[PDB]
From Swiss-Prot, chains A, B:
Active-site residues, Swiss-Prot/TrEMBL: Q153
Free-text note on domains in this protein's UniProt record: Type I modular polyketide synthases (PKS) catalyze the step-wise condensation of simple carboxylic acid derivatives. They are arranged into modules, where each module is comprised of a set of catalytic activities responsible for a single elongation of the polyketide chain and the appropriate reductive processing of the beta-keto functionality. A minimal elongation module contains a ketosynthase (KS) domain, an acyl transferase (AT) domain, and an acyl-carrier protein (ACP) domain. Optional modification (ketoreductase, dehydratase and enoylreductase) domains may also be present.
Gene: gfsA
Effect of H122A: LM has 10% activity on malonyl-GfsA-ACP-LM substrate
Organism ancestry: Bacteria, Bacillati, Actinomycetota, Actinomycetes, Kitasatosporales
Quaternary structure note: Homodimer. The loading module (LM, residues 13-926) dimerizes. LM cross-links to its cognate acyl-carrier domain in a manner that seems physiological; mutation of residues in the 2 domains alters reactions efficiency in a manner predicted by the cross-linked crystal.
Effect ascribed to mutating H326 to N/Q: LM has 0.16% activity on malonyl-GfsA-ACP-LM substrate
Outcome when changing Q153 to C/L: LM has no activity on malonyl-GfsA-ACP-LM substrate
Effect the entry attributes to changing H326A: LM has no activity on malonyl-GfsA-ACP-LM substrate
Section covered of the full-length record: 25 to 920 of 7481
Main function: First protein in the synthesis of the 16-membered macrolide antibiotics FD-891 and FD-892. Composed of 5 modules; the first is a loading module (LM) that synthesizes a starter unit used by the first elongation module for polyketide chain elongation. The starter unit is extended by multiple rounds of addition of malonyl-CoA or methylmalonyl-CoA, and other modifications to help generate the final products.
Extra facts: The macrolide antibiotics FD-891 and FD-892 induce morphological changes of human promyelocytic leukemia (HL-60) cells and have cytocidal activity against tumor cell lines in vitro. FD-891 produced by Streptomyces sp. MAFF 225003 and MAFF 225006 inhibits growth of rice and alfalfa seedlings and may cause russet scab in potatoes.
Protein name: Polyketide synthase GfsA
Organism domain of life: Bacteria
Ketosynthase family 3 (KS3) domain ranges (all copies): 2-402
C-alpha cells in the first residue's frame, strides 16, 4: 500500500539506559528503572535520568550562558541527534545543505515553568518548544521540514508517522523522528496528581489486577529514517522496516479523556490493511499499556477484536512503561525503540508488574498473552505493532518488521573535540573492542568503520597493528602547507621499497611502471658490464649480496632513488596526501621536477639513467667530506688556496667535493679547529670540478628532452629559491645542477617564507629531515618495516589536521559497516541561577 | 504536480475584525487595528481582541468551572471551528463519526503561565496545548488525525500544509486547519521585549525605512479544506484553491534566528514548480513581512530572485501585520485568510506603514511593489502566494488561486440554543437580509440555506411570506408522539383543497389520483341525477355556485373529505411529517384506515362512494343536535321514553340523531335546562335508527373488500379504544360504524394514555381540534389561505421538536447555497480566580 521506510539508526536516553545496549540489558534482565525522586530533584516515584542538568555545550559550540537558559530537552535532543546519526554510520557534516527533516514530539515545558517562577535574551530561544526540533536543523545545517508536534501522550509516535509521510512524498530524503519528555518542575507533578491518573504504588500494572494508574518516566529517543529503496541502494544497516503507520482520533468518546474501543479498532484495521499484514503474521504488540482501570481493558478489547480473532496462537503483548514509567510525550518512541531492539535481537523480553490478569480483560476470549520472560522469537519475517494514545484522543499505531583480505597493517583512527574527550573515546573503543560485541567484528571492519563512518574531530590519534589485542593495547595506552623534500644519494639502502611493494599495490604498480622504463635504459647501456637485469631485484636484494652491492654504483643508485620516490609520491596521492611545494637534494630534484610536471616519466628516466651512467664512467680519486662550518668560512678558506662546495646544508653544515687529497687538506683544517667532519661513502666527487668531463655529454642528453612549466611550485637548490617556469625549462639548468652547489638550507628558508609549516622527506630514511630541523619535520619512511614507518608519518600529518583519505587505505576490502560506540560527551552542569 | 485542495469555508477572530466581512472592512478601509494595551489587560502597543475572557460555555455543553480553568485559545478555536463549518454550509452533526482532521498551529501558553503564577482536575485538560486541536475533534466526534504543530511564527501555515497533505493521502476527507495566539500573560510580553524584536513605535513598517521590529497581535482563524474533486462533486462553495504548499528550514544560517535568503529562494522555486505556475502568472504575495531590519531585505531579495526576475510588471506585495500586528503562531492563517478574501473580492488592499522604501531593499532591481491603495485585480485566473517564517528557521509558502421558480410561500427557519440567542439570531439574519450582501441573495435561496445549511437547535421559529420585506419584518418582530385525527362531515367547505392544489404538486398529484378513482365510482352511480363530472370541480367551485351546492350532498361530501384528507396526509409525508397513531370522526375513520394500510385506495374509494350514495338515497326527515350534556344524562333521558346518541364528543358534549320531531323533543329538554344546543346542518340522521334501511346494502359492499392488519396503530371510535388487527378487518365492523355512536372523547383519552402529546386535525378546518382541547392540539388547515394555515401548523410541530424536512419543501428549485451569518454566541466571562 505505502512505500516501506527503513530505520537505519536510533538513540535513547531513558531511566537506567543511557543508550540502546544498556536499554537491552535493562529489558533483557526483566529489571525496573522506576525509583524514588532523587536528591537533586504516587508522585514520589518515577523513572529518572541520572542527571538532567549536565550537557557538553562545548561540543555543540554553545556558550555556558546560552546553555544555562536552554531547556534541558533541547540539550538532550542535540545529543540524541548526534548519537542517532553516528549509530546510522552517517558523518553529520555530509548532511549540511541536504533535505534532512526533523520531527519531534514534545508536550511539556518544565524548564520554562522553573524560569517564570533578571530577564536575558538567551531565554526566548532557550524556552521556546519549537527550537527542540529547529535547533537540530540549525546545528546540522538541514533544509528539510523541522517541527514539534503535540498530541499529548501519542506525540513522539505521531512525529514518526509525519516523518514517514515526508519521506514517502520526497519532501525529506532522510529524517530524525521521536520525542522527549523531562520531568523537571514540581508544578507538572501536582497537575497530574490532581487529575488523579497516578498509581499510588508507583507502578504501571499493565493488564494486571492491581492496575491503579501510571508512574511517570522521563527521557527521549530518535530513529533515523530513509525509504527502504534509498537505504538498500546506499548500503545502510537496516534495523527495522516501517510497513505502515496511522493516526486517528477517538471522536465521540464517553468523556474528553476516555479512550474509544471503536476508534482503536478502526485504527488497527486500517493500518494492518495498508501494511498488507494479517493477524497471524503479527508476532508482538508494544501496548500504550499505562495500567489504568479504564484504559487497560479498552486497549485489550480492541486488539482482541482485530488481531486476536484471526489467530490460533495467543498474541504476546507488553509495555516498556512497566520498566521505565510513562514518558508521556516521548512514550511512543520508547515503545518503537523496544520493538526495534526485539526485532534485531530476534528475542521478546518480559513485561513487568504482571501476575494476575485484570478481571475486565478476558485474555483467553481475546487471544492475547502478557510476555513474562525473555525468549527467542521466530516466524509465526518477524512483525511487531506499536500503539501510542493521547488523553485528547489522538491515537497512533506503527507496524514494524525485521530487516529483509585487506591491509596487513591496520590503522584504527580515533578523534574527539578535546584531549579529555579523546582519552574517553579511546577508553570506550578499547572496552567495546574487547567485548563479545566488539569480538564479533573484523579488526579490518572496525578500521574501515572508524575511517568512513565517524567525524575526524580536532584531536586525533592513529593506532596501528596486526590484530585486535595489539590495537586495543595501543588504545588503552592512549587513554592514559606541506613541503615535500625528495632525498639524494646517501639515502639509498639495501631492500629500499621492498616492504611498501609487498604492502601497497598502488606503490607496486607505480614502481613496476618506473622500473620498466628504467630497465630498458639500463639494459641498453648498463652501468655494470653484462647487466640486463631488473632494477627492482637490485633494490630489493638482501644487504651484502652481489645485486645489493650494485645498488651503491651511482649508475643504479640515481635511478633507484627516482623509482622509490615516484612510487611513494603516487602511493601518498592515493591516500589524499599531496604537497603544496616540492624541492629535492641533487637527484631528488629530478623526482620533484617530474611530479611537478616539468618532465614526463620517459624524459625523467632518460635524464637520471644518463646522469648516473655518465658519472659512473668518471675515474676513481673523487671525495666528499661534510664539514661543521658556514659557507662563508669554507669559501674564505678555499679562496686562499681541484675542490669546491658541493652543498650548503645549514648555516654551519657544508660538503666539500673534489680530488681526494685536496678534500683531505680542507678536512684536516676544520678537524684541526675541532669541528666535526665526516667522509661521505661516495664513488665520485659530486657537484665539483671532477664533474667537468661529463658536462658536454650530459648537456647533449638534456637537449633531447621536453620541459613544461611546473603545475606545483618547485624550489631550486641551484638558486636556493622558488624556480621561475623558465628556470627548470632550459637544458643548461640541469647541466649547472650536476656541477654547482646544492643550496639546500636556502631552499628550506625559501619554503618557510612561502608558509610551509610541515616538511616531509620522500625517500628511504631521514637524512634530509635531520638537515631541515638543523635548519614540523616528518620523514615519510624511517628498526621498523617501511609500512609502519609510513603509517606513523601519515598518522602525524592527520593529527596536525591534514585530511588523509583513510577510506582509500582500505581500497579493495569487502567492508562491512560495524556499530561503534557514539561520541564520549564531556558533560558539565548548566542550570538557571534560581 | 499535487492534487489541488479547495477552501470551502473560513472563520477568524482578529483585532477589530470578529469575522470575515468585518476583516474585509478593516483591510479595504486601509485601517490599523493596532492600539494600546486595554484597561482589563514597544510592548504598550498591540492588536487586541475586544474581550479574551468571554465564551459561550453553555453552547458547547461546558460547565462554567471547566470553562474558567480552560485556556481561552481552546475556547476561541471551538467557536472558530463552529463558525468555519457554518461558513462552509456544513451541518456539524453530519460530520459525527467521519474522517474530519484538525490541524492547529499554536506556539504559546499564556493561560497556563497565569495559572502557575488550589489545584483542581479541570486544569490538566484546560491547560494542555494538545486539547486546542483535540477538543474540537471530541466536540464534533471527528475520527481524523487531530494535532497541534509548533514551528514558532510559521505554525499556523505549516498546519495548513499538513492538512493539505492528509487530504491528498486520503487520511482526512475534510480538514480544519489554522492556528491561534492570545497575548494574555505579561511574562510573554517581557521575554519578547528582552529578545529586542519589538518596534518601540508599535508598528510593523513592512519594507519601509522606519523598519525597527514588529508589534504583537493576537487572534485566530481556520479554513475548511477538501480535495477540489470532492468539493465540486459535493457542490460546495469554493473560496480558493490551494495548488501547492511547501515547508523547509533555513539550515546553516548566520545565527539560529537569522533568516536565510538561500532557503527562502529554494522554498519558492520548489513550491511554484509543483503548483505548475510561472512568476508572471502570480498576482500578489502576502509576505511574512514583520518590519525587522534583518528580515525585510532577505525576504525581498528572495522574492525578487524567484518571482520578480521572470516579470515585466512589478509584483505587488503586502502584509496584514501592518493592520493587526504579528500574530506569531497564528500569523500565517491571518495571511492566508487575507489572500482568500482578496481572491474572492477580486481586489487588492493597502499594506500600511509604507511611504519610503528600505534603503537595503532595491524594489526596482527586484521588480516588486508595496500595495498602497485598494484596487481591482485582473488576470496578469488570479494567483496569490503566502509566506510564513519561524524564528527557528522553519518556513512555509502556500500558492492559492481563485475558484475555477420555487414555492410562492417561503419559510425562513431560524434556531438557537436559548431564547436570548434566538432573538439575536433573528436580529442578525434581519440585518444581513437588509444589507447589500443579503439583497444580492434570492429569498428562495435564503430559505433553502436556512433549511439545509444550518443546525435546527432547541429554540425554533419559522417566519413565512412572499418577499424579503415581509420575511425581514417578521424576523425584526421575533427579535423583540403525533396523533392524526381525521375530520368528519361538517368540516367540508366550498373550495376545500384548491389552494393546496395550486401551491403543492405532491398534494395535486395525490389528489388527482384519489379524484380519478372516485370520479369513476360517482360517474357509474352518481348521487346527483345526470352527473358524470369531476369531484375536483365540485370541491374547488366558488361558494354558492351550483357545483358548490353538490358538495353538501353526503354522496359527494364523504368522498370529498376522503380525497382532501389522503392528499394532505401524502403532502405531510413528503415533508417528513407522519403520525405515531391515527383516528377519525365517522368518515374520517375510513381515511385513517386507508393510510394505516387496512384498505387499498380502490377499496377505500369504493367504501366511501357507496357509504355516501346509500345514505343520500334515504328519505328526508332526519336531524342531529349537539347537546351540552354527559353521555349518562342523554342516555338516562332517552331510556325513560326513533332517536339515539350519534356521538360522544366530550364529558359534556353529545350529538343525538334520528326522526326530526323526536330529536327536537330531546333538544328542548336540554335547552329548557339552560344547556347549549345546536341543530347540525345535515341531510340525514347519521349514526341513528334512520341508517337501519341501508345497512344490508352497505354490508354487501364491505363484504366485497379486502382488509389487511394496520401498519400504524388505529384507535376505533366504535370501541373508543385501540383497534385489534381483527377489529377493522371484518365487514361487520364497518356496518356497525355507520350505525352506532362515534366514541370520539374515549378515543382521544385512549391516545393520551398511549403517550400522544400532540393531536393534529387532518381536514379542512378545526372542528375535531376544538373538540380535543374541550377534552398539544394543532389544526393542519384552519381568514387565511390553506398553504399559510398549513405552514403555520407545521411551523408549530417543528418549534415543539418535530423533525420537519424543510429541505423537501424546496424540492424542484435550482437552489444556490448562500452565505448566512454564523451562530449568535451568548458569551459570559470565564476566568481564573487569581
Ligand atoms: Na478519548
Ligand atoms: Na534562520
Amino acid at each position: 500500500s505505502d512505500e516501506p521506510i527503513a530505520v537505519i539508526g536510533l538513540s535513547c536516553r531513558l531511566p537506567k539506559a543511557s543508550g540502546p545496549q544498556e536499554l537491552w540489558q535493562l529489558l533483557d534482565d526483566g529489571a525496573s528503572a522506576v525509583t524514588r525522586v532523587p536528591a537533586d530533584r504516587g508522585a514520589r516515584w518515577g523513572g529518572f535520568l541520572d542527571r538532567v542538568d549536565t550537557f557538553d555545550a562545548g561540543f555543540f559550540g554553545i556558550s555556558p550562558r546560552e546553555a544555562a537558559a536552554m531547556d534541558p530537552q533541547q540539550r538532550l535532543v542535540l545529543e540524541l541527534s548526534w548519537e542517532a546519526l553516528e549509530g546510522a554510520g552517517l558523518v553529520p557534516a555530509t548532511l549540511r545543505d541536504t533535505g534532512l527533516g526533523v520531527f519531534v514530539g514534545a508536550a511539556r515545558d518544565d524548564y520554562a515553568t522553573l524560569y517564570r517562577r533578571a530577564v536575558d535574551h538567551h531565554a526566548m530561544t532557550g524556552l521556546h518548544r519549537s527550537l527542540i526540533a529547529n535547533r537540530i536543523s540549525y546545528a546540522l545545517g538541514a533544509h528539510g521540514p523541522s517541527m514539534v508536534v503535540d498530541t499529548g501522550q501519542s506525540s513522539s509516535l505521531v512525529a514518526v508517522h509525519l516523518a514517514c509521510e515526508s519521506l514517502r512524498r520526497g519532501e525529506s530524503d532522510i529524517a530524525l523522528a521521536g520525542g522527549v519528555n523531562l520531568n523537571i518542575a514540581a508544578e507538572s507533578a501536582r497537575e497530574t496528581a490532581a487529575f488523579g491518573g497516578l498509581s499510588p504504588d508507583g507502578q504501571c500494572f499493565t493488564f494486571d489486577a492491581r492496575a491503579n494508574g501510571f508512574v511517570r518516566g522521563e527521557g527521549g529517543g530518535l530513529v533515523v529514517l530513509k525509504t527502504l529503496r534509498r537505504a538498500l541502494a546506499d548500503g545502510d544497516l537496516v534495523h527495522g522496516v516501517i510497513l505502515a503507520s496511522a493516526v486517528n482520533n477517538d471522536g465521540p468518546s464517553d468523556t474528553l479523556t476516555t479512550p474509544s474501543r471503536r476508534a482503536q479498532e478502526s485504527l488497527l484495521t486500517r493500518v494492518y490493511r495498508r501494511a498488507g499484514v494479517t493477524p497471524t503474521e503479527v508476532g508482538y504488540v508494544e501496548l500504550h499499556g499505562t495500567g489504568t482501570k479504564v484504559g487497560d481493558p479498552i486497549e485489550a478489547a480492541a486488539l482482541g477484536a482485530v488481531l486476536g480473532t484471526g489467530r490460533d496462537t495467543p498474541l504476546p503483548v507488553g509495555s516498556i512503561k512497566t520498566n521505565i514509567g510513562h514518558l508521556e510525550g516521548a512514550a511512543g518512541i520508547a515503545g518503537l525503540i523496544k520493538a526495534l531492539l526485539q526485532l534485531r535481537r530476534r528475542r521478546l523480553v518480559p513485561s513487568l508488574n504482571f501476575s494476575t490478569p485484570n478481571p475486565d480483560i478476558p485474555l483467553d476470549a481475546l487471544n492475547l498473552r502478557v510476555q513474562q520472560e525473555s525468549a527467542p522469537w521466530a516466524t509465526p519475517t518477524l512483525v511487531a505493532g506499536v500503539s501510542s494514545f493521547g488523553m485528547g484522543g489522538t491515537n497512533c499505531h506503527v507496524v514494524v518488521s525485521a530487516a529483509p583480505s585487506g591491509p596487513a597493517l591496520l590503522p584504527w583512527v580515533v578523534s574527539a573535540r578535546s584531549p579529555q574527550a579523546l582519552r574517553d573515546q579511546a577508553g570506550r573503543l578499547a572496552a567495546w573492542a574487547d567485548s563479545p560485541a566488539g569480538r564479533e567484528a573484523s579488526p579490518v571492519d572496525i578500521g574501515w568503520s572508524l575511517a568512513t563512518s565517524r567525524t575526524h574531530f580536532e584531536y586525533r590519534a592513529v593506532v596501528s597493528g596486526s590484530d585486535r589485542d595489539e590495537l586495543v593495547a595501543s588504545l588503552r595506552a592512549l587513554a592514559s602547507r606541506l613541503g615535500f623534500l625528495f632525498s639524494g644519494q646517501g639515502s639509498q639502502r639495501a631492500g629500499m621499497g621492498r616492504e611498501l611493494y609487498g604492502a601497497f599495490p598502488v606503490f607496486a604498480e607505480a614502481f613496476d611502471e618506473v622500473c620498466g622504463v628504467l630497465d630498458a635504459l639500463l639494459g641498453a647501456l648498463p652501468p655494470s658490464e653484462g647487466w640486463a637485469g631488473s632494477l627492482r631485484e637490485v633494490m630489493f636484494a638482501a644487504e651484502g649480496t652481489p645485486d645489493s652491492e650494485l645498488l651503491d654504483r651511482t649508475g643504479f643508485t640515481q635511478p633507484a632513488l627516482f623509482a622509490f620516490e615516484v612510487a611513494l609520491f603516487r602511493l601518498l596521492e592515493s591516500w589524499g596526501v599531496r604537497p603544496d611545494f616540492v624541492a629535492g637534494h641533487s637527484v631528488g630534484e629530478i623526482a620533484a621536477a617530474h611530479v611537478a610536471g616539468v618532465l614526463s616519466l620517459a624524459d625523467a628516466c632518460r635524464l637520471v639513467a644518463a646522469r648516473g651512467r655518465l658519472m659512473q664512467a668518471l675515474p676513481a680519486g673523487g671525495a666528499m667530506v661534510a664539514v661543521e662550518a658556514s659557507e662563508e668560512e669554507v669559501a674564505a678558506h678555499l679562496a686562499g688556496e681541484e675542490v669546491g662546495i658541493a652543498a650548503v646544508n645549514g648555516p654551519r653544515s657544508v660538503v666539500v667535493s673534489g680530488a681526494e687529497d685536496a678534500v683531505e687538506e680542507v678536512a684536516e683544517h676544520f678537524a684541526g679547529l675541532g669541528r666535526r667532519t665526516r667522509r661521505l661513502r661516495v664513488s665520485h666527487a659530486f657537484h665539483s670540478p671532477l664533474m667537468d668531463p661529463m658536462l658536454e655529454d650530459f648537456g647533449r642528453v638534456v637537449r633531447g628532452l621536453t620541459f613544461d612549466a611546473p603545475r606545483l611550485p618547485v624550489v631550486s637548490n641551484l638558486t636556493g629559491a622558488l624556480a621561475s617556469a623558465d628556470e627548470l625549462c632550459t637544458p643548461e639548468y640541469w647541466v649547472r645542477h650536476v656541477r654547482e652547489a646544492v643550496r639546500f638550507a636556502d631552499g628550506v628558508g625559501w619554503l618557510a617564507g612561502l608558509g610551509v609549516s610541515t616538511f616531509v622527506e620522500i625517500g628511504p630514511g631521514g637524512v634530509l629531515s635531520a638537515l631541515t630541523q638543523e635548519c614540523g619535520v616528518v620523514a615519510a619512511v624511517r628498526r621498523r618495516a617501511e609500512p609502519v614507518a609510513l603509517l606513523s608519518a601519515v598518522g602525524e600529518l592527520f593529527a596536525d589536521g591534514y585530511p588523509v583519505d583513510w577510506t582509500a587505505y582500505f581500497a579493495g576490502w569487502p567492508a562491512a559497516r560495524v556499530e561503534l560506540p557514539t561520541y564520549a560527551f564531556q558533560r558539565s552542569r548548566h542550570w538557571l541561577e534560581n
